[PDB]
Structure 1
Amino acid sequence: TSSRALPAHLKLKYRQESQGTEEEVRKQDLREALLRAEAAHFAT
């Protein structure tokens, strides 16, 4: 109907294996990782 209403980007992208899917974040331990990263930045 209009130029900007034409079909475009018909394929929705999903997070892949290494991009941080729900499974990987659920398996991961975010608390300890956050603590190590905070300590590492403090070290500088």
Structure 2
Amino acid sequence: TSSRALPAHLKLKYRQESQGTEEEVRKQDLREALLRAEAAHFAT
């Protein structure tokens, strides 16, 4: 129909292994990581 409605980007991209999937975020400990990062920023 219209030029902009033609098929394009037909492959949906999913997060790969080291890109931060749900499995890793559930496995990771975000709290102590956040406090450590804040302390590292504070040290500057």
TM-score by length of 1: 0.99
Instruction: State the 4+ residue runs in structure 1 displaced beyond 4 angstroms.
Output: none
Could you list the runs of 5+ residues in structure 2 that have no partner in the other structure?
Answer: none
Aligned length in residues = 44
- State how far apart, in whole Å, the 2-side matches of 1:15 and 1:8 are: 20
Q: SS where residue 24 of structure 1 aligns?
A: helix
- State how far apart, in whole Å, the 1-side matches of 2:16 and 2:43 are: 33
Q: What is the root-mean-square deviation in Å for CA atoms of aligned residues?
A: 0.2
Could you list the runs of 5+ residues in structure 1 that have no partner in the other structure?
Answer: none
- State how far apart, in whole Å, the 1-side matches of 2:23 and 2:9 are: 26
The answer to whether the aligner puts 1:12 opposite 2:12 as a matched pair is: yes
How far residue 9 of structure 1 moved from its aligned partner, in angstroms, is 0.1
TM-score by length of 2: 0.99
Q: Percent identity?
A: 100
